[PDB]
Symmetry: C4
């Protein structure tokens, strides 16, 4: 567990799991390359196979430590049922002494992630039917729809604003489902802002 190879390959699977977490929710939400991350995530299990509290040291371990989780994570087969891919996030779950100025990129990454997830949730809501998308259609010169890029960037925009507590006013919740989601995103924004943006301050302080 102390090799000049384990480190580089672990950071490689880190980049690959960020790939997963950034491109499965978008894909599943908006419009619902990856075989290589499949191959690396199924090489990770065997890399555990080839690599005690009191002292130093493997196969039945995963049979009881973490396998069925990883099995339902990566297993081929409705196009919705791909959501279970997100289970791969657990790969960033149990290595947190060999992942942590890296914490700063991690914090920016997770903030952007939460913004992305809330953006796609917001898109699902606004597409489950006065709302917001009938409005975004009218703001820009696209009345009726808009291109997928316009929708995604406006969703990420509104989510990022109402998270950072600005509220530009071009995008405004106007239906009880939207308003309840807004109360929830404002709760999450209060909590996450208060925690992580004092966190970043303390990080830059100790440096």
């Amino acid at each position: 567990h102390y090799s000049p190879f384990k480190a580089v390959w672990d950071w490689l699977i880190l980049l690959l799991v960020i790939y997963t977490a950034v491109f499965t929710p978008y894909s599943a939400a908006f419009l619902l390359v990856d075989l290589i991350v499949d191959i690396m995530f199924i090489v990770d299990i065997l890399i555990n196979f080839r690599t005690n509290a009191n002292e130093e040291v493997i196969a039945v371990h995963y049979f009881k430590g973490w396998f069925l989780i990883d099995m339902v994570a990566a297993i081929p087969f409705i196009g919705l049922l791909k959501t279970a891919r997100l289970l791969r996030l657990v790969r960033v779950a149990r290595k947190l002494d060999r992942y942590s100025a890296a914490v700063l990129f991690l914090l920016m990454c997770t903030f952007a992630l939460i913004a992305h997830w809330l953006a796609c949730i917001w898109y699902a809501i606004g597409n489950m039917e006065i709302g917001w998308l009938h409005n975004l259609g009218d703001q820009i010169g696209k009345p009726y729809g808009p291109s997928i890029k316009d929708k995604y960037v406006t969703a990420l925009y509104f989510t990022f604003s109402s998270l950072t507590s600005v509220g530009f006013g071009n995008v405004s919740p106007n239906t009880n489902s939207e308003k309840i989601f807004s109360i929830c995103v404002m709760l999450i924004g209060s909590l996450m802002y208060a925690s992580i943006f004092g966190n970043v301050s303390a990080i830059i302080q100790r440096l």
Copy 2:
């Protein structure tokens, strides 16, 4: 050990009271909790205590009685029920205190939501008439009129200001001065702990 379990049950119950009482008074099951909250008094009668050095009648007679029974009696006069809140005040984990603080915030948002509803209702010769026009019910069920109230209250309290709700009549504007004054205090008092305890967790 059962005293502690029972106290937590009654804490759930008093949160129930504080959540569903002001809503009932302003915008508008009861007996099952009122029986528990009146036998609360008999429980206080049997309940023990420790003295300063020497480790019940005069005890509760002087602790809180002229404020318990006034609310513990089976219309607006019912509002005095809110005094049950002090029940938690006497009887005070991270995963518990954080939930507590989030509950204070949600409760404050609720109280201010119903005050705002009262204020917007005292004038029908504003924001209410300036609400039913966004939503396609021009003139509004209690679901809407409550949810936009909580929406605006959370907006102003978290300092977002979305731009649908806008105080537009002097009483509303004074209410806004007040909520922003306390809200600036809340964000600078409440989130003075969510961003302060985390070193412990």
Copy 3:
């Protein structure tokens, strides 16, 4: 020969600070939109009849006047007297040399409020100085087109609080160059204030 730490001047000075608060709230409000003087002027001899640097409260009140002339007397003569009552704001400097005898939340709340007050008065002075803007647009929100004194003052206080606490409700939107630059200034001072004063609030809440 009267002293400073007397239980008499304590209450009287709390009353005169209530009075200087009275002024600071009522002199800008007066020009922007009799006993109040005898107390402040009598304070000249109340302070006449102190403590030296490395000495006690020295008696023989003839060693008092020169010390006073050293400490604080000059602009106080303009204080104890067109828009010349603007000079009454110099009464505020009295709490300057007296602020040490107070120590706390209430001072902070009051100063946030009265800073908002001064800025409301300046915002009104700007909106009225140019005769499309903001005050010639408020008349369309309410049903007063072309507005009382109460209405204008309360909207100005509303907008000043909105900008100082970073809400921005959207019905007060600076729309001419003077207003925009004043808004740059208020947002800078707000980024200063909401930071400083409210870190102070956090610390005070910590102490208790």
Copy 4:
């Protein structure tokens, strides 16, 4: 580090601030050789100046680590933007400025102001490439604006987005502006918090 420099260094600080303020503003929307002269005298003053060493005691120095930048900036040759390189000069001296907190506060406020300025220039570039200028031309009664407006409203919106107020008169409404606003909200989320924690701390030092 002479007393002559113990004043002329703050003088060249004012000069580099002048440049950082008037070079982007000149390149964006649209006395000079005078400041080029001071810039070219500084390097010679450094030539006859001193240099230090860790275990030892205090012309090729300019050849050592800081050579082509001071050169490429001190030439009166969208192009003159090169001058902005001069900025690095302040980095070369912060070991002596920050001794005065009463000065570092002014430094931080000027940092915030400068960032607001550069972002105002970027915002104007984005709006002027091909919007929000059409949305400005209608509030101010000048439909189609004098550069005074187009600049001060841009600085206004930039201070808004960076201070998290969002007055809602001007608002991003075309994908490029939206992405710029994402970036400005993020850079604000960084700098606001960090620099104003710094403000709280330094103002607390009294």
